[PDB]
């Protein structure tokens, strides 16, 4: 929450989105369109990045179909160190390579994506535009 | 929000009156229904016509020909009070006959506690000559008119941080 991210593609219901992992450390995730405030910031070129492989099956979790779960070893499992496929890491690095040059070219946007949105005293979101 | 209506009507023809006379009235009313009611009210007191034995032959809504021009209106009225023995002439300066009547109704209710039912408008005339003009209306007609802005109390904005300038 509060992170600034770059929309890659619009999935069936949500948006496949990632703030460049080398900028703010937000990996490629689906985010429901009702939980985002779209900004009026200058657009980032996402035409050169492949978005066909980001599907519901790609982001799908492993099927469980049983009530047994939870363990300290279970939490020691998953994690970025384990679980996280090398292909997922490669895809994150590839989209980073295709996205960074645009935010490097347009000024102040790299660090804008690094920052975190927050409300301050006297701020009224209905009057404010993003 | 009153409106000026030209109401023309006549009683229905009979064997005694094959060709009845058409009578027209200019009267101010919020809508056409009240305008027809007041027309029958005035025609009933004068000239032996019910609503039943008469009919409204024409209804028209009159707008101000010059609504952007300041004018002086002299209004003669019949005022009915607790004593009810009164005629008045008042003058109101504004851009339309409808507004002058509205300002008359507010002023008459404020100063004499007279209601819409109690007041009947004898005639509304535009006074064109300055000499023909009420002292207050004349001294508004002063060519060199100038005066300071009167007090006007200037979202919720409670708990102001600074004392107001009010000047």
């Amino acid at each position: 929450r509060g992170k600034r991210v770059v929309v890659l593609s619009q999935l069936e219901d949500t948006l496949v989105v990632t703030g460049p992992y080398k900028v703010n450390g937000v990996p490629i995730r689906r985010v429901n369109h009702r939980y985002v405030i779209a900004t009026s910031a200058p657009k980032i070129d996402v035409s050169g990045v492949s978005v066909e492989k980001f599907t519901k099956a790609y982001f799908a979790k492993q099927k469980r179909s049983g009530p047994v779960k939870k363990d300290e070893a279970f939490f020691a499992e998953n994690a970025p160190k384990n679980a996280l496929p090398a292909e997922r890491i490669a895809d994150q690095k590839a989209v980073d390579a295709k996205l960074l040059p645009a935010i490097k070219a347009i000024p102040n946007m790299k660090e804008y994506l690094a920052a975190s949105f927050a409300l301050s005293n006297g701020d009224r979101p209905h009057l404010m535009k993003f | 929000a009153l409106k000026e209506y030209q109401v023309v009507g006549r009683k229905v023809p009979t064997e005694h009156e094959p060709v009845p006379k058409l009578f027209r009235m200019r009267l101010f009313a919020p809508n056409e229904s009240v305008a027809k009611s007041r027309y029958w009210y005035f025609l009933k007191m004068i000239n032996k016509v019910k609503k039943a034995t008469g009919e409204i032959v024409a209804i028209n809504e009159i707008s101000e020909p010059k609504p952007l021009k300041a004018k002086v209106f002299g209004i003669w009225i019949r005022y009915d009070s607790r004593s009810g023995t009164h005629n008045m002439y008042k003058e109101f300066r504004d851009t339309t006959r409808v507004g002058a009547v509205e300002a008359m109704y507010a002023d008459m209710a404020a100063r004499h506690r007279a209601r819409f039912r109690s007041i009947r408008i004898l005639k509304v005339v535009e006074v064109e000559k300055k000499e023909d003009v009420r002292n207050y209306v004349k001294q508004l007609l002063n060519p060199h008119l100038k005066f300071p802005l009167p007090h006007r109390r200037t979202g919720k904005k409670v708990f102001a941080p600074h004392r107001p300038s009010t000047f």
Binding site: - | Q6, R26, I62, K123
Partner: protein, 51 residues
């Protein structure tokens, strides 16, 4: 039969069911459109602007 009442004004399928004419009805048609022949008699205007 008819377990739920559907408003034809809001349900275009129910409106299609009841009225097989809403398909071709053509609400907006330009009628007055050739000279706009202003029709007000001089005697009418004088009585209107009388008193």
């Amino acid at each position: 039969a008819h377990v739920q009442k559907k408003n034809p004004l809001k349900n275009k399928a129910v409106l299609s069911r009841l009225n097989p004419y809403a398909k071709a009805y053509k609400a907006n048609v330009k009628i007055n459109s050739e000279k706009t022949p202003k029709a007000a008699g001089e005697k009418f205007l004088s009585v209107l602007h009388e008193n």
